[PDB]
Design a binder for this molecule. Structure first.
Ligand SMILES: [Zn+2]
Ligand SMILES: [Zn+2]
Ligand SMILES: [Zn+2]
Ligand SMILES: [Zn+2]
Lengths: 308, 310, 306, 306
């Protein structure tokens, strides 16, 4: 289809004198479970897309989605939040310093209709609203709402794949029961629920009477503040982030940044150890317990909303 | 140069004077990378693979350490999970009285079993062709194995030993420069096996002068009275799908019954939808312990030196 | 002739020869007896000249040094010139070859350690008819320089007109303080090096005060010549790179640099053709009196004794 | 385009014509709105750039000024930027033609003085011919520049990502002392000039303070911006002879200069090789805070308000 499925693809200048670009990277058109491109996922949710190739013992491999968070180990506070909750979202995000269209998209993502109406009224106060700004605002709102219904299981018809269950509190997942984490998860918007399911791979992957443990400890948490990149115990995971993923904005915003460096040649060591299969460090998002029922359609190509 | 085979199991040669034998050591056997075992022999005997763990900083510099992924299935239990058996249970874990001679001699030397290797000599001496080839080949195997072990044994005459590194496997008191039960068991090991554990098992924490770099938030191996084992200090074992094809066929005649796992259903369309994204490997690396680098150190040194604990 | 004190660093083993990296300033007959490269490497200071101008036409330059201590650094990492009772801790002499250790021991008058080095080198084979005369050359050169800067050496002409009080309270009263006592405790070469690196905050010449800075940037406490301000946080002193990277290339060290992000080139061009005010931290402390009749303008080092 | 506020300065009577000797930098959009020549002549300050370096590769420049007040000068001779109350006393407006007086009165918001100058010139029998147009042109240019630098002008951009609290102390976090209110009383152009000339002692970039000087070399008091250290004797500032503008060629000079008698060429040529540490007195005072969200590296000067 070559259709931009990224939710943030509708960003546009509400004023009809400046034309705005479309930095959504190639993956935006790759119709997958994600409804956001890797560039926007990096810039707004501090996550990078990846695939988890689970293998069986003989031939057959199947790949799930996963994300690695880009939170530095030395960060603290609101800087560790990957996906803020509705309460703290307006504080974690600097919505004031963003294009009005992106703010509208964010307000819709968290079901803050009051903010959307405030933006609409503010834009009405301006001149030129009736002719062009109204049309562009309506187009952005329509696209965003359409994506949200696509990812919201509670929409007319909207077939929902209730074959497989997902929890974020393993304390009672094997009992089919949930914790507080999955309650907070249910509080989330459908689009954000799907995004969390895509980004946060389940630490356990019970399939028909078969448990597959992928990690021995979760790397993310679901707390009141939202989906956070803090280990459940001990110092934060060393996550060295370079300027590649950064893709910083505001070329005139002077920002200080404490960055570590390794002093030493390391070239002879690199040459000596080269040729081995490198083990990637990163930090995948592992948390919870996913149950795949005996009867199910789990290799379904087209995305279907998953409701617990 | 790079024409000397550093793998300890390279010397394996049939003691009999007729049947030849060429050990299938991987090319990596020829690199002086601190490993004194090749990747294929590591897989065959210690059930581990050889990987490199690259650690980057925020700037344009990086450095690589060694790490290994064990090849123990989640369903395995008992003495099948043991990667590196201890000096006592090793003869019970390995089936030494099946892998003919030579390799058995190397294994006995690796665990400092003088009596067993002497018994091997006693049995071999009665052969008709002893003073012929047999004695030469046995002596050559012993010499090569002893040289390999001295290269790693820090308590060898004029054996330079690095001491800017401190490695622990107990963590609870590693911040206080003190190890524990796991470290005590580790010290009992042979020098070659101590180096092998240091190479294979990457530290959970890495503390350079003062900055602590945490690589994993939970150890994946353990050092218990039975040795270095691939059991987590938690509930069900990590799902490790053994690549059956990759693992050598060993004995074509021996009939082994293996209950393999099989995923069912078409998955090519899913791969097409998820083709292009960087794949996060599902291997199980060996993470455990705490490694400290003194402010004054020669960590980025090419030549291997035994890293004896202070 | 190389006058850097650290010019004699060699290898006591006969095969490997090591000509210590010395800046071209080593050969100058300036008051310094150390080169800029070695001053940076060991005492973490960079040499500069402070020019003082009259009103119409006459400029005379005094010496000065800027320290290279980051504001974030704390503790024993702030001392530039350690005192003789703590230097073996601040300096990691153990990892400093042997000739450099000998020079450092001589600088601080640690004859015991020098003799220990002597014994250690006598035990080894190939010392008598080889390493001997090499350790001797190192010791002879080091002692020659130290007695050159030591005012008490025999028939050593010593200047006495000019006075230097690192405690400014009673300097106008012709008297030092605790810092000045600690300064007197130092070795002659170290006293000269301090008097060179650390410019005086005040300059009383012909009874005329010429206060240069309004606050000292260093302090002479027990630990030594500390690069610490005696008020509030430390001075922002960014040091970029490529000064001591000669450090053992296999020594893996972590460094917490502080980078600025954003395009500065438009702002740079906006204000480019302006005289730039340097952002280094000079070593200002104390009081210096010229004492009317004197020979301050003499182009040859003479030991200065308070 | 001449941005200097004193650029207009045209003889009100159509007569012998002179152009103000504005320096080349008058044609730079550096945010000074004053040339170095006029800055020196009137506010006894010299322009300079303070480069702040990061640890790796980046450096951003910042404006600064060095005052030209001799240490011996006292009283109203030490004031660089007089307050709106004492300026008619500090400045000899009487001996400043008339266009300079007009500009200065506008700078200090003295519309009464402007009106009396205008009326005195109205009484001229040859007023409406040519003087009215030139007077109005000078007024228009001056008012336009002041509006450019006045944040309260109609729909005028005013950035508030950056906070400049003088007299630091309690002002560190977010406060502002008596000096801060005194500064607030100034005109927008004068506030911009002070903030351009007086670099901040501290610079907290959203978490990280960058102390640039131990003590302030200037102070904001009731008399105005003063070149006086709050620590005792004034800083030695050897203002040379030639660099001073020879405005009045007939005024009797009488100037007590300072001289350094003695040969100094040997020392100069002995130590010429070393990097020189400038002896100018910059203007350090206060505390500048940069918020996490900011446009500080953005050119196209915007008036900054507290
Ligand atoms: Zn996008
Ligand atoms: Zn091998
Ligand atoms: Zn030198
Ligand atoms: Zn001008």
């Amino acid at each position: 289809m070559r259709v931009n499925r990224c939710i943030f693809a509708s960003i546009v200048s509400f004023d009809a004198c400046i034309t705005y670009k479309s930095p959504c990277s190639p993956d935006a058109y790759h119709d997958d479970g994600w409804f956001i491109c890797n560039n926007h996922l990096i810039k707004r949710f501090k996550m990078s897309k990846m695939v988890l190739p689970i293998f069986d013992e003989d031939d057959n491999q199947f790949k799930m989605t996963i994300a690695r968070h880009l939170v530095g180990n030395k960060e603290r506070g609101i800087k560790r939040i990957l996906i803020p909750s509705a309460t703290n979202y307006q504080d974690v995000f600097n919505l004031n310093s963003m294009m009005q269209a992106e703010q509208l998209i964010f307000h819709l993502i968290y079901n803050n209709e009051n903010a959307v109406n405030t933006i609409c009224d503010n834009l009405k106060y301006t001149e030129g609203f009736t002719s062009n700004t109204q049309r562009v605002i309506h187009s952005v709102y329509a696209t965003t709402k359409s994506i949200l219904d696509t990812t919201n299981p509670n929409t007319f018809c909207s077939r929902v794949s209730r074959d497989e269950l997902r929890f974020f509190d393993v304390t009672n997942a094997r009992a089919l029961r949930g914790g507080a984490g999955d309650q907070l998860f249910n509080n989330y918007s459908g689009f954000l629920q799907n995004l969390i399911r895509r980004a946060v791979a389940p630490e356990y992957l019970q399939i028909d009477t078969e448990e597959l443990r992928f990690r021995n400890c979760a790397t993310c948490i679901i707390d009141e503040t939202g989906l956070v990149a803090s280990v459940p115990d001990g110092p934060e995971l060393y996550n060295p982030i370079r300027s590649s993923d950064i893709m910083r904005s505001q070329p005139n915003r002077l920002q200080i940044r404490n960055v570590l460096k390794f002093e030493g040649d390391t070239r002879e060591l690199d040459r000596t150890l080269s040729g081995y299969e490198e083990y990637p460090t990163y930090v995948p998002l592992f948390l919870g317990y996913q149950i795949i029922n005996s009867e199910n359609n789990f290799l379904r190509n087209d995305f279907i909303p998953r409701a617990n």
